């Protein structure tokens, strides 16, 4: 028996470590379904990802900044000088079966790891998540994804090839020797001298295969620990209350939900680190400080640092015999825009007031400051980025270069201001269309003409009517509002069967009628479970 | 202020976490006392110490074979060829402020890693700790010491010099290559090809800072996991059972107690790690081939593999056309060792049948074939490790080097066989020894004359008394027994004061009545609990 072992199994490990109760209140748990909850665990699966394909690249390569000739299989670049860690990462992808399918999908991995970070930050933010008891574990995300961004950009630094190199001399070496005071001090400790020096890329490598992701990993783990000791927000809808968690159980549903969704995740990356070529370095050649080339942008997030260096004009200062030169903004500029991100959520309570305990979240619409705050936040963010960009946008838009760098620099001032605007009247617009819904019902679609001649639209009420049929007007609960007959279910289903077959009627009726019941009976339930509470 | 923060501050914590039970069940949780329950703790702060000096050493290693000219201030090297790992080593003891301190941190503190899991394991072996409800426990301590063992090895094979090379060679290589039928593919799939080679330093150190230290790390968690929830064993003594745990709540005593502790330990690594030197390898040159010393010892926890290579007789087998060299039998013998450790809990309820809940300790005069056992393998280790030094022995202490080969031949059969019966005998004594003090009460050491010229011993009864005086004799308990009359309190004490002036005596007689009472109410309170359990 299978049944036997396992009782065996499970009588074994009771008896050793009596963990019933406490994995039964696992078991038992709760997770709201909502879709934009799951956003937290793509960036968790691409940094499982990534943390599988680093510890495989790891076995390969060699940081070496000592000076070698190529001698491999890659004949464009043979007898060319160059670093060991830029040969071992050719290596990698000519010389080890499977190398740079390793290295692409650890690449996409990374950029799906920053992006989702981005979009799952985007969800906190709009929806209120982060306001208390959970401000600390925004805090923890904000520092997450400062180090997500550090460690990607460490990560491509190490094959030291001609684009990531050119990226560390302008952003890494030029900017840090050009903070105040101190700014040579610090380049010296992280360099061991002048730029590129031979300490560079096994410290950074020391550091991007160990010491920030053992940090992030820390993190995370704090992380999802308050989440699932705190116990997930959710969004108002029937049954839902300031004290209850509505969802599903996390045996058997929840779990299987996850394992599939990790399952798919990794999927994508796989097809994408198969069919689409990312950081192709044998094409760049090695480092060499007099070499460049057209279009030095760094991975996406990073490239809004690089906009910000771009667009910002030329101002320095020249005071007794020192200099401070224009990157000293762009430094102080990110570490503005670093505090500004993580302490959001009391900079709110200060200004709204609100210090109230908050387990039901926030329709976006009904919060139209913060929503048009953060769509303002994303413009300019977005208008970084492509700044970084900007030569390109011009080589393949037909843009000149210097109107791309004045568009630019007016955009930061006033994109930003139009889209606050437009986002704000958006949000109280959308409130509007749900008072329109709440007030009249639903519109149908269906017009009718009455025999004096005039147009009426049908309209589908979302509750009771009085006497002349009108519905009495329904009171907004921070919950979506029906807009579409169909999605109410006015459309039916079409006869069961196969595509291209039916079955027999009685199994048509028999299904229809089962699926009617059972839908009924949960909205029963709901409606009952909120009746009582 | 002060007190009022820290109430603002819990009461935030609280409204937020609720972590007021939790927390409160982690500061009652009560720990044993015994001084040997502290020989985890050494190997648990050995590793701390392990895991900071070793990110400090990657800020500057770097782990290349890449052949160079050292350049550095070490006058003996000037000119000499060596790969950078050399080269960097080199620079870590000589270029770094406080380089070498930490490097000689490093390497003292992985010889107290080793050492404390070898002395902490014979505690768990030798007190019965390992049984159930805790084989589990056992099983993850004994891959902890073979991950320490591997891990320690491939840690001093990074700086590339002559002596650690020569190890490699020998044992990493030579052995590998010699299994059967798959040897020269696990070779080839290690090295890359034939030794050196170019991957092997850079491969050992992402092994040694990252992938083997992260299992480790895994691994302790659980480990202390296991014994946190587990709730440690505890000696038979008054009041304790089988069913309870006598000793000191965490909050404050048992935290005051573990803090002092790693800070001494911390001091103890300090001091050696700048008074004695260790592995200088500026004095070993870099690894070459063609070169060797005499005396190639490794680092003491590797040695008994390296005496077992030394004893082994030369035997070989040449079957169609094949070789089966001499190193097969070493790496067999590992595995088998290794098997053994890893197995004993079970072996042991299968010999003994005995498959009952044990919290409470057996002292090792009471299991006397466990000690003989565990006395005769410690034979064994230490003739292997001391063959290892075999020709050290041989320099030093004046003894052929063909007798010290034959001494560890005949004395790896003989040694082990004498010392279990020794152990065995001993073990027994000590029983017998415990049982007199049981009939007959304590020797106090003072002998009379009576009046017909007898010389009678006075004793001290350690239980009721006959009308006749002599004692009732008493159950042995599982517990040690009084053996010296001033351990019994028969000494008294000197006299208050400083060492050198003597205290008013109103404050003497107060303090001392003040110890009696306070004596004399915590054994009422251990009998009282006893009586009523
Ligand atoms: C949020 C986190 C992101 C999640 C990812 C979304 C993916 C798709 C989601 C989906 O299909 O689900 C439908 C889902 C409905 O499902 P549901 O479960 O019923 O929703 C639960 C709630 O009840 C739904 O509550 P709700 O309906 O109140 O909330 C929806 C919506 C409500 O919208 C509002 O409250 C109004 C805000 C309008 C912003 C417009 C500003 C820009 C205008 C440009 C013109 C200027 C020139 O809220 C937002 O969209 C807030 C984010 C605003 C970001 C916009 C930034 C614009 C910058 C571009 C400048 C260039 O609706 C959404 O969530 C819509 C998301 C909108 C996506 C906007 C992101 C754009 C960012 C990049 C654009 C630039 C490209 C160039
Ligand atoms: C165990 C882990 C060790 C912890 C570290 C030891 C620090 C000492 C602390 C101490 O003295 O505290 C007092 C402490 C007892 O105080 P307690 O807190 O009241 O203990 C609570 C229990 O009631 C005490 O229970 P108990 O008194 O029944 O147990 C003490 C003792 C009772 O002993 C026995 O059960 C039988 C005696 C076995 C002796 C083995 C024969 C040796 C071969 C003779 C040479 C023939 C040639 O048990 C053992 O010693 C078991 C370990 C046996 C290892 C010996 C291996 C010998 C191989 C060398 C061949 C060369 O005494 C010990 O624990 C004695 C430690 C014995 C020394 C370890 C063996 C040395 C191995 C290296 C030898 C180097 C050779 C060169
Ligand atoms: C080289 C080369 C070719 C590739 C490199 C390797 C690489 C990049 C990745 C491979 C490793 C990897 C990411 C494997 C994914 C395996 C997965 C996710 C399989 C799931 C399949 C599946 C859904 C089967 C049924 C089991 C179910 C229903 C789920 C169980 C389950 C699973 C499977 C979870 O992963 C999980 C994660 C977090 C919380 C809970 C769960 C959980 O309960
Ligand atoms: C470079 C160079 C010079 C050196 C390299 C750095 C190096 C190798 C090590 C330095 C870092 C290190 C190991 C520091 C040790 C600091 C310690 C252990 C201080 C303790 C001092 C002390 C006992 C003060 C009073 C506080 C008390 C009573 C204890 C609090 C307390 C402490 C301090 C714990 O460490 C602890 C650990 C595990 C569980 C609980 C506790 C705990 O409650
Ligand atoms: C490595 C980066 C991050 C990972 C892997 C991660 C992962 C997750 C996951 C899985 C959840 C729970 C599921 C969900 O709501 O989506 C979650 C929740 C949360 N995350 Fe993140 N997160 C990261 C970064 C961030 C960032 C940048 C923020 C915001 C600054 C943030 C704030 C939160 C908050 C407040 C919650 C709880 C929200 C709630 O209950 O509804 N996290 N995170
Ligand atoms: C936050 C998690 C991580 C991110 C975002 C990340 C990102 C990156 C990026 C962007 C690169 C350059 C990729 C290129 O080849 O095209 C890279 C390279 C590398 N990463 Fe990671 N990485 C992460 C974690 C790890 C980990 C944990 C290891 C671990 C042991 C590792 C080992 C490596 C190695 C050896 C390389 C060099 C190999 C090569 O470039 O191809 N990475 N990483
Ligand atoms: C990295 C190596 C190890 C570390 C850091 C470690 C640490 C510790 C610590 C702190 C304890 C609790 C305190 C004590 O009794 O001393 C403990 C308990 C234990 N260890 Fe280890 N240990 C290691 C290896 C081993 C080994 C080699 C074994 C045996 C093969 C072992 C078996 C146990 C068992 C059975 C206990 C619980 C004993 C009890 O309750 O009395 N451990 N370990
Ligand atoms: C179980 C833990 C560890 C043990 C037993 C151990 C052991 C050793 C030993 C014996 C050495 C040779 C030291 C010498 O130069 O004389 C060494 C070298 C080294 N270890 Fe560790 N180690 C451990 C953990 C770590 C960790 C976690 C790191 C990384 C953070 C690390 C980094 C290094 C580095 C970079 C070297 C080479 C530099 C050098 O030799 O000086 N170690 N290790
Ligand atoms: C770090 C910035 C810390 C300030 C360094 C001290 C300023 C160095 C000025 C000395 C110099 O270089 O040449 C002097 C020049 C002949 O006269 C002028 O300055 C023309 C006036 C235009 C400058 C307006 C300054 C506004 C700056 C602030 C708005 C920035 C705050 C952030
Ligand atoms: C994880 C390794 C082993 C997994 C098997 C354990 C789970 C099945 C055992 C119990 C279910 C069947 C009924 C039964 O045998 O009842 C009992 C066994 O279960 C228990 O009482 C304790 C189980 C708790 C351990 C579970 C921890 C983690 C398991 C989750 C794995 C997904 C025995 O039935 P009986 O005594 O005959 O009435
Ligand atoms: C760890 C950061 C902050 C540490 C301060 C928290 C501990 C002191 C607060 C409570 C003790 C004093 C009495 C008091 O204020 O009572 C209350 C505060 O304590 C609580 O009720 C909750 C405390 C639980 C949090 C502790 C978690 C970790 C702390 C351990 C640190 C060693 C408030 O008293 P009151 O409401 O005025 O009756």
Chains 1, 2 share one sequence.
Not at 217 to 223: K, N, P
Not at 403 to 432: C, H, K, N
Request: hydrophobic fraction near 50%; glycine fraction near 10%.
């Amino acid at each position: 028996d299978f049944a036997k072992l396992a009782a065996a199994q499970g009588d074994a490990i009771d008896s050793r470590y009596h963990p019933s109760a406490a994995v039964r209140r696992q078991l038992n748990k709760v997770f709201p379904t909502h879709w934009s909850f799951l956003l937290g665990e793509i960036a968790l699966y691409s940094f499982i990802i990534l943390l599988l394909t680093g510890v495989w690249l790891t076995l390969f390569f060699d940081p070496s900044m000592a000076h070698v000739t190529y001698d491999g299989v890659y004949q464009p670049l043979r007898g060319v000088q160059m670093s060991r860690a830029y040969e071992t990462a050719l290596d990698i992808s000519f010389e080890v079966r499977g190398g740079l399918f390793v290295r692409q999908v650890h690449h996409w991995a990374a950029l799906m790891f920053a992006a989702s970070i981005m979009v799952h930050l985007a969800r906190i933010f709009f929806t209120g998540a982060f306001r208390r008891p959970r401000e600390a574990n925004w805090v923890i995300g904000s520092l997450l994804l400062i180090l997500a961004m550090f460690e990607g950009f460490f990560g491509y630094s190490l094959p030291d090839d001609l684009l990531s190199g050119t990226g560390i001399r302008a952003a890494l070496s030029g900017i840090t020797m050009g903070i105040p005071v101190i700014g040579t001090w610090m380049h010296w400790a992280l360099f061991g001298g002048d730029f590129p020096g031979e300490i560079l890329i096994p410290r950074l490598y020391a550091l991007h295969i160990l010491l920030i992701p053992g940090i992030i990993l820390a993190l995370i783990g704090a992380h999802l620990a308050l989440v699932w000791f705190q116990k997930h927000t959710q969004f108002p809808g029937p049954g839902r209350t300031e004290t209850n968690v509505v969802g599903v159980r996390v045996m058997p549903v929840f779990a299987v939900k996850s394992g599939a969704f990790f399952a798919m995740i990794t999927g994508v990356l796989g097809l994408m680190g198969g069919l689409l070529t990312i950081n192709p370095i044998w094409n760049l050649g090695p480092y060499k400080p007099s070499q460049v080339s057209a279009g030095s942008q760094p991975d996406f997030y990073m490239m809004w640092t690089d906009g910000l260096i771009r667009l910002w004009p030329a101002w320095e200062f020249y005071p007794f015999g020192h200099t401070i030169p224009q990157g000293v903004w762009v430094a102080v500029g990110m570490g503005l825009v670093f505090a500004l991100l993580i302490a959001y959520p009391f900079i709110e309570k200060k200004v709204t007031g609100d210090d109230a305990h908050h387990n039901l979240l926030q329709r976006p619409r009904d919060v139209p400051v913060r929503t048009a705050i953060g769509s303002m936040a994303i413009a300019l963010y977005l208008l970084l980025t492509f700044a970084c960009m900007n030569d390109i946008i011009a080589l393949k838009f037909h843009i000149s270069l210097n109107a791309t760098t004045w568009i630019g620099r007016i955009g930061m001032v006033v994109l930003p201001a139009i889209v606050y605007f437009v986002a704000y009247r958006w949000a109280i617009s959308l409130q509007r269309s749900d008072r329109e819904v709440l007030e009249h019902g639903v519109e149908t679609g269906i017009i009718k003409r009455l025999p004096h001649g005039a147009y009426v639209e049908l309209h589908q009420p979302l509750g009771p009517v009085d006497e002349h049929g009108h519905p009495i007007p329904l009171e907004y609960a921070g919950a979506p509002l029906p807009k579409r007959m169909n999605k109410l279910g006015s459309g039916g289903a079409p006869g069961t069967g196969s595509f291209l077959f039916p079955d027999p009627a009685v199994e048509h009726e028999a299904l229809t009628e089962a699926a009617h019941a059972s839908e009924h009976k949960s909205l029963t339930a709901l409606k009952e479970h909120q009746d009582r509470i």
